[PDB]
Design a protein around this ligand. Structure first.
Ligand SMILES: C[N+]1(C)C[C@H](O)C[C@@H]1C(=O)O
Ligand SMILES: C[N+]1(C)C[C@H](O)C[C@@H]1C(=O)O
Ligand SMILES: C[N+]1(C)C[C@H](O)C[C@@H]1C(=O)O
Ligand SMILES: C[N+]1(C)C[C@H](O)C[C@@H]1C(=O)O
Ligand SMILES: [Mg+2]
Ligand SMILES: [Mg+2]
Ligand SMILES: [Mg+2]
Ligand SMILES: [Mg+2]
Ligand SMILES: [Mg+2]
Ligand SMILES: [Mg+2]
Ligand SMILES: [Mg+2]
Ligand SMILES: [Mg+2]
Ligand SMILES: [Mg+2]
Ligand SMILES: [Mg+2]
Lengths: 369, 369, 369, 369
């Protein structure tokens, strides 16, 4: 098999009842980028990458499209059924830019699954669970209001909550954590507190020191991995990496040196499913719980996240986060990814199990053959 | 003296009022393996190895018999009165497989003791105590029920309890520990909490962080020694190794680098009494308390554990655990190992002090001469 | 699809012009164990595991068959198209025993490849090279004798030589290394020197110190990883792990903490292709060169090694070692694995590309349904 | 059985063709202390301790007798057939003073062996070799003079030489090492260079740096273990501890943290055979070569060293050093320890196999009942 065409699309996703606030990024609408790979046989696969604003991570929508335009001519003729070979070929065309490479990677797995008649999760080691947990991430807000929302989401069925903090005096974050805990204690709901790179070590230390009785994991409290390595010995709560886990080498450093207790891992950041599967295997060997998330995006990226998440040993699965609740229009109304009772049912069809209504995207901003 | 015959037996041991639940293994009946060594003089010694299900450790009943069948022809003619020489000879025939080698080792010490007219404990440095402490290990269950059982076992005389946890949400484990402590506090009963390799560092950290007022030692909370080394600086409760202590080299690493505060050590895992005695000497030099246990098994392995345990400095002796309370039929009704008042009286006769009713075992599954 | 039957075979492999001498194992004839998995449809896949004598590693032929006998009944009905799910299922039946699990893993990948019509290497990320390099490993022998063989094998086309040392005064090992280097310098041939766990740190230090001008990597010079970590900073030659690389967790330690510069890795030791592929991804992220070998065995295990080897980035591929030159009768007369010009061609057919002549093995020694 | 009497003897040992020059002690005549333990039955065992002058180690002849006088009354009635119980009993009477405790330890093993009819080596795991290697240690002297003696002693059969250095400009030590190497290279003789605590790190660094082509191990180059840990990474020669190995705890530190590559170990320093056997097991698990020596003394301490030495794995046995060549009158004319061909035959009789002629010692200087 050979790649015959690659099509790049720009598409807009407004935030229902926004904005969505992260200590490092507030957005009102997201620009996603879709990739369609067409084989010489005519069969097509789909990928997607959607940064959550331009300030969250070293990635942005215009940059995704620039990266894809750089690599695409060099990929025409490649065998899309060989994800590692294909990844090396991308590396031969452009250094870094995992978030763009990930879209090609995901399209190729979709195409592979359709070709062989198999679900992507089964190409990645096998379906361990047909329905996977999700988690709900609150925005930054008034303590009482965040606690109210947390209670509601637990009642909806979410087995885990992530409370966003930072960008304001830490006393308010601590009050938020305490008020949330008062409403969810004794429900068995797991808790994460995400500083999104915004806390000086001063405040990360204070948060943990003041709340030993509250069972959160502290997710990416500080900006750099060096700062996290420096506070870890003095912090009695588990610490998870998110933004710092930028590649497999960094994950190997963190696992091998005992620098964290788990991960919030994004598919596009790590470079796609080929790398994410290796990431999964590393975490399983070391009993490091993790989520399988992305920054944002619709059915295509969400299905890719759900497929890898379906392969995770259940006791290590911290959930699959998706932007679906904030997206008005699905790409696939019959099989698209939907949260139900705080969980996500894996699509049942071949490949990603998603057939996007291509009409929605508009003509490609760039085509290659 | 020379070994003239080696006989290998398969024998079944059903669990009274089971199953017995460990986070890593639930069993309903155990398959033990017995070894009889006959000297040219006609004198015989007995050994035993009995994994606690095939998933607890890298060992199983069929594997024990395969290992013994591999080594046995190469041991005919060896001097059974030289335990170190004999161990090196085994190593010359098969790499690893300590749990099988241990059965030959124990049979040889039994034979040595009978030949010289001395108790095995006196071959291992001398009887420091005629009666040794034991400890009772609970299964995993409802918090209140486990607390009730803990109170009963303290009333029976057990000076130490081990609470098994893991394989479920850690909130339940923590509730169990708290309810047990409420019933046993102020009795002077020592407490261990055994995660049996099942806790991610996330949960080990939480358990310790939440319970500074409860004086447990945390036994093998995490799967690998690397994970334990990573959490140790952040855990204020003593940490003991069990499954990780797979050989004397590992014990030397753990003692020399300060990676743990004690051990739950199994005779078969370490490779027998020759190695266990060295283990004992290392712990004594570093004031590291430990038990002398095994995975399971009847009078033969239990007596071997009791003999080495009788040599331990009393202040370091965390007890000898035996499967006797879960075994309906003793091998030796006159001198077999029995728990009385939470303690074990050392047999008074030469060798292990045990004469098994060989009839019980059936014909050997393999014989060598 | 579901596993309907599992059949275990025992088969002898006489060493051509024997014996083969490793510092830890001298072998005259090897006992291989073959496994055939049959699906409900009748489609079959083949696996193989063959310890290189019982003292090289904690593995042996009788032990392989005992482990398979323990696991097989619990695998009837499993889906063989899900290698990770299947591996966890095996872990739920027996702890450890990777060398036995690997035979099931390999048969399942063979079956998967046949079912989808794809080569195993293309189920593991894709073929990076159709012609895979091998390496020649000399046995221990006299310095001039070994230097001759080294020159002869370089001429035959092998791009890398491994010289086995140990088990005798180290000055003889050093003389051998110097005389081999005299023959092969200027031929572009890479050099490994394998101590096979046999050198005290005293001697490993001496070997490196005396030979800075000879560009060997020192493979598993000492018995334990702890010993290797202790000399590493005092050794100017690259150090590779072999025997110490017992599982993915240990690989993560070694890579993350920088304890070695590469690996000799055996498929059965790591537990099969699912784990080997993850191992490959770990090494690629850290630019750690490695081989894809096994202990011994015929066309089945050799094809498995060749398929994973064909996925390795060429600049990191230290070779695929196979026992074929020492094996008189191939299982597959037409398409079995053969070394040609010091290299190995990847088979063309689906699955492993091997069709064993079952009549060579005799009837199964154990059958499960 | 019970100790009925303890008798302490003082005896002079003139140095044949004296003196003997160590960087830390020059000696013309040594004051040995013998101990006879008599059981209720009248059976007796013998021990010995003989510091090599009062400045080599924190031990001296008057100190040996004072320590024995302190402990002896508290040992009347003890069971001498339990070496570990007996050792703890001594610890309960006097802290430290291993060199004195060792004399009691050795007499008790002698008695035990006589009582059971077994050789001491067979009470310590078993005889691995009937003929034990020794090593020759040169005194400090002129480079050409020492090189001659080195050649002469190699011819006599010693498989290892130890060259003493220090106490003068290091260039003279380096010249000595080079001239010795010139004589013994190509003879298969192993080389140790002993600084006896006398080199500043400045000079130890220089000695190793200048001589990479000379295969010595550097024994106790610096005064403290702290100094040795500090230079270790900058020294390419193996480093052995001698004087720093004061107890089992320090051995555990050195081995567990990889601070040395072997030991010169003295029986009296470590505290007797009970501790020496544990020391042996520690070294065997880590492939650390070691000698079994003492400071000085006649047939009694020499036989004790020979018996433990006969249990050491041959590949790790650096030799048993004894003072016999410097001692005119043996205690046992028939079966005393004698070096022959640079090796020592293990005595055949029960216990140590030595029967001292008591009349040589004079009446006891102290008797206890
Ligand atoms: C993955 N989230 C839950 C959604 C946002 O993209 C960021 C947030 C996190 O940082 O974990
Ligand atoms: C030794 N036990 C008390 C009995 C079981 O064999 C396991 C358990 C332990 O892991 O410590
Ligand atoms: C891979 N070999 C060449 C074959 C033997 O199985 C061992 C050897 C090695 O240890 O590297
Ligand atoms: C063991 N010696 C050879 C004899 C002396 O007691 C000291 C010396 C050494 O330090 O190695
Ligand atoms: Mg819930
Ligand atoms: Mg985050
Ligand atoms: Mg009590
Ligand atoms: Mg335990
Ligand atoms: Mg070539
Ligand atoms: Mg090797
Ligand atoms: Mg059937
Ligand atoms: Mg010689
Ligand atoms: Mg010395
Ligand atoms: Mg008296």
């Amino acid at each position: 098999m050979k790649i015959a065409e690659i099509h790049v699309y720009a598409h807009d996703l407004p935030v229902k009842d926004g904005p969505y606030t992260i200590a490092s990024s507030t957005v009102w609408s997201l620009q996603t980028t879709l990739v369609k790979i067409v084989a010489d046989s005519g069969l097509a696969g789909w990928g997607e990458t959607c940064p959550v604003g331009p300030t969250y991570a070293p990635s942005h929508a215009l940059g995704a499209r620039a990266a894809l335009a750089e690599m695409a001519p060099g990929l025409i003729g490649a065998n899309p059924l060989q994800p590692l070979v294909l990844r090396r070929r991308m590396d031969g065309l452009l250094c870094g830019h995992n978030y763009a490479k990930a879209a090609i990677d995901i399209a190729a797995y979709d195409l592979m699954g359709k070709h062989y008649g198999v679900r992507v999760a089964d190409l990645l080691g096998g379906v361990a669970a047909e329905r996977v947990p999700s988690y709900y991430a609150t925005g930054i807000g008034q303590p009482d209001e965040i606690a109210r929302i947390a209670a509601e989401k637990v009642a909806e069925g979410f087995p885990r909550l992530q409370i966003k903090i930072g960008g304001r005096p830490v006393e308010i974050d601590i009050e938020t954590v305490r008020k949330v805990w008062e409403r969810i204690r004794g429900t068995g709901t797991r808790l994460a507190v995400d500083g999104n790179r915004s806390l000086p070590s001063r405040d990360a230390l204070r948060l943990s020191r003041e709340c030993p009785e509250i069972p959160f994991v502290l997710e990416q409290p500080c900006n750099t991995l060096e700062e996290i390595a420096a506070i870890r010995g003095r912090v009695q709560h588990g610490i998870y990496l998110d933004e710092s886990g930028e590649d497999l080498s960094t994950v190997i450093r963190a696992a091998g040196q005992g620098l964290c207790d788990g991960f919030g891992m994004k598919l596009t950041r790590i470079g796609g499913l080929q790398q994410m599967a290796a990431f999964r295997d590393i975490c399983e060997a070391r009993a490091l719980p993790h989520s399988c998330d992305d920054a944002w995006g619709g059915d295509i990226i969400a299905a890719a996240c759900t497929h890898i998440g379906a392969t995770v040993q259940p006791r290590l699965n911290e959930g699959v986060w998706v932007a679906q609740p904030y997206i008005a229009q699905p790409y696939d109304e019959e099989n698209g990814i939907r949260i139900a009772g705080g969980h996500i049912d894996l699509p049942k069809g071949p490949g990603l199990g998603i057939t996007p209504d291509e009409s929605l995207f508009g003509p490609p901003v760039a085509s290659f053959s």
